[PDB]
Design a protein around this ligand. Structure first.
Ligand SMILES: *[C@@H]1O[C@H](CO)[C@@H](O[C@@H]2O[C@H](CO)[C@@H](O[C@@H]3O[C@H](CO)[C@@H](O)[C@H](O)[C@@H]3O)[C@H](O)[C@H]2NC(C)=O)[C@H](O)[C@H]1NC(C)=O
Ligand SMILES: *[C@@H]1O[C@H](CO)[C@@H](O[C@@H]2O[C@H](CO)[C@@H](O)[C@H](O)[C@H]2NC(C)=O)[C@H](O)[C@H]1NC(C)=O
Ligand SMILES: *[C@@H]1O[C@H](CO)[C@@H](O[C@@H]2O[C@H](CO)[C@@H](O)[C@H](O)[C@H]2NC(C)=O)[C@H](O)[C@H]1NC(C)=O
Ligand SMILES: *[C@@H]1O[C@H](CO)[C@@H](O[C@@H]2O[C@H](CO)[C@@H](O)[C@H](O)[C@H]2NC(C)=O)[C@H](O)[C@H]1NC(C)=O
Ligand SMILES: *[C@@H]1O[C@H](CO)[C@@H](O)[C@H](O)[C@H]1NC(C)=O
Ligand SMILES: *[C@@H]1O[C@H](CO)[C@@H](O)[C@H](O)[C@H]1NC(C)=O
Ligand SMILES: *[C@@H]1O[C@H](CO)[C@@H](O)[C@H](O)[C@H]1NC(C)=O
Ligand SMILES: *[C@@H]1O[C@H](CO)[C@@H](O)[C@H](O)[C@H]1NC(C)=O
Ligand SMILES: *[C@@H]1O[C@H](CO)[C@@H](O)[C@H](O)[C@H]1NC(C)=O
Ligand SMILES: *[C@@H]1O[C@H](CO)[C@@H](O)[C@H](O)[C@H]1NC(C)=O
Ligand SMILES: *[C@@H]1O[C@H](CO)[C@@H](O)[C@H](O)[C@H]1NC(C)=O
Lengths: 131, 230, 534, 222, 231, 223
């Protein structure tokens, strides 16, 4: 199998495979498999008081498969950099899940003595360490 | 009585919410006056203060001393020593302490109200449990929405160690009573726990009236399926 | 899937065991939870020991678990094993129900004891063994014989009168030495896997018949686990004894249907896929040697064997040594260009990466040579040595400096094609290889040919450049062993950056370079030699 | 140091399960003078036992005493007065203790385990909470099935005072960690709390699995 | 016929792949002779190559002029002000051109082959369509694997303007015919488009048979009461 | 200017749908008077008054002729040539007229919209493509339902020639942008191509949603 996309902001995985046929070669078979993981316990925006549970999930194929990173092409005798999509609007996407390799913090005001301080919390405590 | 000397670690509310992490050295059971003299091993800008005497158990003088500016040597892991000397002595005492090792990170659980309290429709009770952390010190705070509640509105017990299934760990609880109008309307509540082994010194968890599932509805659409993935 | 460990583990009762599992050294993985679990017929691991302080009821006092973040490993030690510990287990990180795990099988079997009526013998596959057998004093000249007990029946393999079985031709011998010895010995060289079982001696047909039944086990070699990355490198150490120091060596790779395909020999052999990226060093006093493979790909993983046989392949009766390789694919080695194209008379500039922590080391640059077992000599280093054939056309610069250095090579020819390696003195050692191709075309910068000068006269030299280099920086420099340094400021529109030399003694003789750069990243250069007459 | 007399209520564990409860009138801060005379004034029932001295605060001869057999007149609602004699003043000592009133019954809850613990396949945690009782003394016991568990297998905190507005009330918690496969079998667990206000002297609640889930999903695919 | 002057903007291919932003000034329809004059305001390259006095059909003579320059200045917003002093006027005549404003980057689509062209097993057609860009000039290339195909193997049309959804935009097309044994095997093809309004001035799109219309899809939804982390 | 004389063909838009298909015998560039006599070597009996006697661009005079009262029925394919006259040097000029063979019928393909456009719901794009015909003369007309669309709501390109294996052939494209609600509702669209070589001179295609039927999805949910 060949991995087409593996998206972590919405936790989607797409693979595909060609199975030929040596009997009248228009009965060829092309197969595509999609794997979706739906969370049921986290908010709409990722900040704590927010619309207590997301209950509607929307998956558009063209939004999952996009390649938002440049590339290098050799045209005649030079190498040029090129973009790979039309939809790379300049980051304001709503993610459905957390990412295991990224940080997510929050800011809370607390009181210590006759003052008020503004401290920072951690929502995924494994992934935020100063090293 | 018999004179003793010990060293106390700086308090956790200052290491996480302030700047001045005062470390202190004490003394108990002196007899007649205070001619006591002190020193430490580091003296990097150490403006040491001795202060006045006091009265200990049954009545006995007891003078301590404090060393300002001890945050970065503590978190870096240096070691401190304290020796005193009373005028009826030919042997200075000693004490040492350091920031501990072999630590563990607490597990925080926030529990929904029981089912019998929601029917009587007066007040409901939320519970916060922290479990499995090796040094005994911890902080617990609550939030309603985004505003912090005052400390005179909830009750939190002390930190005791739990039965052994390996290494030795500790645990703590707290409860909060809130009105059933504010709970059945859709407000959210959060519990924040602070500890040394946590990464950014604080972590939190949150709950509301929907969490705990009932028969919830979910909808998935999956709009275009065969659509040239590129 | 990025987790790796030993697939099969064997042990006997009463003794301890130690298991190692591997993970990428990402900071998420250095602080997450490690676990050791056992799965039954319900589809779920029951955790037995954890990284957070959990020890189960069955493992209290016996086991523990340790984590080493700087390696990227964690170790599980179990003691006082028993026969009820035979089953399937998993190493892993995180939460048990996900798939960041690795499967392990474990088999314990009961040990020896009380069986003084049978002796034992255990050697390695392909080594030497000898069997010692008494034959009684009432026999001086009466037959000595061996008997192989194959299943149903016993057969004969060597008499004391010269009959030796066609399975054992040439690799068996019976010795009764002198010195008044009335025992005998049977020596076997080049042991195979088809020689296991239970033998039995004999001294004659007679009533005496001092038999003593014996065992012969043969050991397969346990593999060694190697954990590497994509586009990195690996070094194998073959360490056979001095008794095979004069035999040919090889390195093959196992496959599905019991077939090694050979990867390298000492009789001059090489696979087509490993062209340009494999070495084979000469051997030591003790016959030890090493094999270096660079630029690792996804299909480079599996079992590897190195052995010793005269025809240079894997065959029955040769000692071996095994390795198990795993390629990560979650690598932090930066994706660099692999092929670099130039034309005749042009230049090339190559970025060579290394690891950021050893920035005070010494760097080198090498050209690979075939037509041998494989060699790779130096061309330039990072302190001021350069090969005599490459004088005035090669330099090494430490310019980007965050785990990258540059090499500049101009005056290209068609001979300069091939594969080139970059090395470091550090402990961690990636070796990166780049190929140089030569194509047709005309170079960008344009300089005159060789230049003369009169003694005591000013000289001016031009260097024209195209319109695409009009946004860069331009320079002239004078080439030396330590590196070329720029000259103080002579510029114009899209043409003619000109060097000028006011007076001339012979100290101004040598090679000079004209080049462009974008601040830190260097580009195309060109060279010109300046003589001085009288 | 300085002398001080104080009494003590009978213990709570000996009222509910045991038979004979004690009643102490201790005298701390004397350092000497072994000739001390305890004498309870309603002098009937048993006979008063004196005590040998001990050490307290590095110098005190803190002598004690026990008047046994007063467990049932405690529950009926009597009143006791202790006295003593110390070698200085013109006065003896005297204190008083009696069972007070306006008591309230505890409300006990037993909570199910959280959901993030079952993912790890280790021990799971049950929590028992008792709230709203007027005298501070309480007991907590745990049961699995019908067999009782020893006291070294769980953890209870003390009983502090909770921030009520109307009247003064107290609260207490306890946790018990059991095996995950024991939970997944279907075994039942129980929490018992004993108090003075409960007439049958013990109340208990019970939790297990299957107590209370089902989701209704809909896909569209256009 | 009538003497008219014009400046001409530099060619897209030379300017994008290089910096040879050469300008071109030309008066058309001179009276009798070739003795004309030229003058630009940025006199950097004073060796302006005046071309030979060529002619044009039905009685027309024209003069050309080139002012060679580099890509740098044209992209920063200078201005260029060619002039002429042909003898049939008593006052000169100018023209001025600069870089364009109010630009839009294009939308690039790459269409899979149709159904009834795959059931003949001889050749297949790929189609690249670029739509919605404000200046009328654009580049189109093709790639197979990673090697650029030569320009004589495909067909590109011109850039017309589309009917108005308010403002003025343009569109192009190009097709490429491919052996059907190479499409069904799994080779990849690519369409590359270059235009002034793009940020990196180039954009490409790759397609193959795996990224086309499939004939069997399997969707598998998995609920997660545990957490959302996507291991 | 330098004079010339040319001859044209009847336009294709009239040959299939009208009765005003008429031919041409023009004269490009003149500075003289009426010395014109036109003679066409088939003489079926029509009326052959001249076209518009007028002028041209940049000071050139011109004459022209058309054949109004006979709609040119040359499906049999005559030679049909014009031989003009003017009082110049002794060569009154003729012209060139013919009908070549090698007629190839077109192949027309109509494409579904790109799937990226369906997710945004503003407007979708359809594409017609006609390929493989030898005479470079073709007309393209769109249809929605059965009401023809006007010529200002779509865009079509010229007719270019394509690289091929010896036989020369031509191609043409066209696009049309419609609203997303009309696509998702279920409306039908059609492309229509008119060419010389066809038996009824027009080829249709059709497309809508639910036009790719054999896709075979399969859904499953666990726990
Ligand atoms: C990387 O992993 C390796 C293998 O897992 C670790 O190697 C071994 O680690 C142990 C414990 O740190 C070392 O044991 C000690 O050895 C000394 C003698 O060298 C002995 O006297 C002590 O009682 C103690 O057991 C061991 O030397 C070391 N090396 C080998 C070859 O076994 C290694 O520790 C890991 N890396 C780091 C930086 O920790
Ligand atoms: C999601 O929540 C975050 C909470 O941090 C929002 O980010 C903050 O938005 C406020 C709005 O005025 C700003 O003042 C803060 O500076 C923002 N903080 C950060 C860290 O971005 C965010 O806007 C929310 N997003 C959505 C789509 O609702
Ligand atoms: C320009 O002059 C230099 C110096 O004389 C020439 O370089 C030498 O060429 C010979 C001929 O092969 C080599 O053996 C030497 O090793 C070269 N280097 C030196 C330092 O002597 C060079 O060949 C001349 N010509 C060109 C075109 O550069
Ligand atoms: C832009 O102008 C320059 C200058 O004329 C052109 O460069 C000339 O190119 C021709 C053909 O290679 C040479 O014969 C001339 O010698 C060149 N002139 C100079 C001064 O170098 C260039 O060709 C023009 N634009 C492009 C894109 O070609
Ligand atoms: C530490 O001691 C100094 C001097 O007594 C005092 O000013 C400061 O506030 C103290 N810091 C604390 C208590 O955090
Ligand atoms: C959701 O579930 C509830 C109960 O299971 C049901 O009454 C309701 O119709 C469902 N749908 C919506 C949209 O609420
Ligand atoms: C774990 O236990 C084994 C055996 O008791 C011992 O060899 C090893 O040193 C222990 N590891 C640690 C970190 O204590
Ligand atoms: C010799 O080898 C063959 C190979 O299978 C085996 O069947 C046979 O039993 C062996 N005989 C002896 C005497 O070793
Ligand atoms: C690159 O080098 C500079 C100079 O030392 C340094 O400041 C910078 O942090 C380095 N960048 C990285 C990513 O290490
Ligand atoms: C340049 O090279 C000469 C001769 O090799 C040497 O003597 C001199 O020191 C070098 N100068 C520098 C700056 O490296
Ligand atoms: C008195 O109390 C002690 C401990 O508090 C207890 O062991 C004993 O049973 C009680 N009763 C008597 C009569 O001692």
């Amino acid at each position: 199998r060949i991995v087409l996309v593996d998206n972590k902001c919405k936790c989607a995985r797409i693979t595909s495979r060609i199975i030929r046929s040596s009997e009248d070669p228009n009965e060829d078979i092309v197969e595509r498999n999609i794997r979706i993981i739906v969370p049921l316990n986290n908010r709409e925006n990722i900040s704590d008081p927010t619309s207590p549970l997301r209950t509607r999930f929307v998956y558009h194929l063209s939004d999952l498969c996009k390649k938002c990173d440049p590339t290098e092409v050799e045209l005649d005798n030079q190498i040029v950099t090129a973009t790979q999509s039309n939809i790379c609007d300049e980051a304001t996407e709503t993610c459905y899940t957390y990412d295991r390799n990224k940080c997510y913090t929050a800011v809370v005001p607390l009181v210590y003595g006759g003052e008020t301080k503004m401290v920072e919390t951690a929502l995924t405590p494994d992934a935020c360490y100063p090293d | 009585c018999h004179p003793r000397l010990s060293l106390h670690r700086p308090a956790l509310e200052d290491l996480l919410l302030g700047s001045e992490a005062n470390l202190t050295c004490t003394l108990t059971g002196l007899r007649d006056a205070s001619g006591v003299t002190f020193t430490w091993t580091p003296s990097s800008g150490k403006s040491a203060v001795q202060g006045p005497p006091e009265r200990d158990l049954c009545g006995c003088y007891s003078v301590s001393s404090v060393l300002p500016g001890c945050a970065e040597p503590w978190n870096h892991g240096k070691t401190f020593t304290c020796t005193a000397a009373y005028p009826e002595s030919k042997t200075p005492l000693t004490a040492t302490l350091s920031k501990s090792g072999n630590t563990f990170r607490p597990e925080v659980h926030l529990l929904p109200p029981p089912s019998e309290e929601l029917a009587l429709n007066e007040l409901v009770t939320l519970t916060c449990l922290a479990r499995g952390f090796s040094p005994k010190d911890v902080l617990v705070r609550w939030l309603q929405g985004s505003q912090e509640l005052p400390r005179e509105k909830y009750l939190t017990w002390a930190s005791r160690q739990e039965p052994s299934q390996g290494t030795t760990t500790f645990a703590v609880t707290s409860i909060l009573r809130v009105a059933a109008e504010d709970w059945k309307k859709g407000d959210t509540f959060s519990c924040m726990v602070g500890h040394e082994a946590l990464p950014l010194a604080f972590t939190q968890k949150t709950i509301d009236r929907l969490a705990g599932k009932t028969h919830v509805n979910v909808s998935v659409v999956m709009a275009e399926v065969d659509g040239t993935c590129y | 899937s990025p987790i790796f460990g030993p697939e099969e583990v064997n042990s006997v009762e009463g003794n301890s065991v130690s298991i190692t599992c591997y993970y990428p050294p990402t900071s998420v993985n250095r602080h997450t939870r490690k676990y050791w679990c056992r799965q039954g017929a319900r589809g779920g691991c029951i955790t037995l020991i954890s990284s957070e302080g959990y020890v189960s009821s069955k493992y209290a006092g016996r086991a523990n678990l340790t984590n080493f973040p700087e390696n990227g490993t964690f170790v599980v030690n179990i003691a006082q094993l028993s026969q009820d510990d035979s089953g399937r287990y998993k190493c892993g990180l995180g939460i048990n129900s996900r798939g960041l795990s690795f499967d392990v099988s474990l088999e314990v079997s009961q040990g020896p004891g009380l069986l003084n009526d049978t002796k034992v013998y255990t050697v390695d596959l392909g080594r030497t063994v000898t069997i010692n057998c008494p034959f009684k004093t009432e026999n001086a000249q009466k037959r000595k014989s061996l008997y192989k007990q194959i299943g149903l029946y016993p057969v004969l393999v060597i008499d004391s009168s010269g009959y030796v079985n066609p399975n054992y031709t040439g690799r068996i011998r019976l010795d009764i030495q002198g010195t008044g010895q009335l025992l005998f010995s049977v020596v076997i060289n080049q042991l195979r896997l088809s020689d296991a079982g239970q033998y039995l001696c004999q001294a004659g047909d007679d009533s005496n018949s001092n038999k003593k039944n014996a065992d012969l086990q043969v050991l397969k070699p346990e593999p060694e686990l190697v954990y590497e990355d994509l586009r990195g490198s690996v070094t194998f150490h073959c360490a056979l004894g001095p008794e095979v120091a004069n035999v040919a060596k090889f390195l093959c790779r196992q496959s599905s249907g019991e077939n090694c395909d050979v990867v390298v020999n000492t009789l001059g052999k090489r696979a087509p896929a490993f062209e340009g990226r494999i070495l084979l060093n000469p051997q030591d006093k003790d016959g030890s040697f090493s094999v270096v493979i660079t630029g690792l790909r996804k299909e480079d993983a599996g079992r590897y064997l190195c052995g010793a046989h005269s025809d240079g392949q894997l065959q029955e009766g040769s000692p071996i040594q095994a390795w198990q390789l795993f390629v990560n694919e979650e690598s932090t080695i930066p994706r660099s260009p692999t092929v670099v194209k130039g034309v005749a008379g042009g230049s090339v500039a190559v970025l060579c990466p290394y690891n950021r922590k050893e920035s005070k080391s010494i760097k080198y640059w090498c050209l690979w040579e075939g037509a041998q077992n494989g060699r790779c000599p130096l061309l330039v280093d990072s302190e001021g040595w350069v090969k005599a054939q490459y004088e005035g056309r090669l330099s090494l610069l430490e310019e980007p400096g965050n785990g990258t250095f540059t090499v500049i090579l101009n005056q290209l020819t068609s001979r300069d094609a091939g594969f080139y390696w970059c090395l470091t003195n550090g402990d961690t050692l990636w070796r990166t290889t780049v190929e140089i191709k030569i194509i047709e075309g005309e170079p960008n910068l344009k300089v005159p040919g060789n230049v003369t000068a009169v003694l005591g006269e000013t000289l001016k030299v031009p260097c024209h450049f195209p319109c695409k280099f009009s946004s860069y920086e331009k320079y002239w420099c004078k080439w030396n062993n330590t590196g070329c340094q720029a000259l103080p400021s002579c510029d114009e529109n899209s043409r003619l950056v000109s060097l000028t030399l006011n007076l001339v003694t012979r100290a101004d003789e040598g090679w000079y370079w004209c080049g462009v750069k974008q601040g830190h990243f260097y580009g195309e250069t060109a060279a010109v030699y300046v003589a001085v007459e009288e």
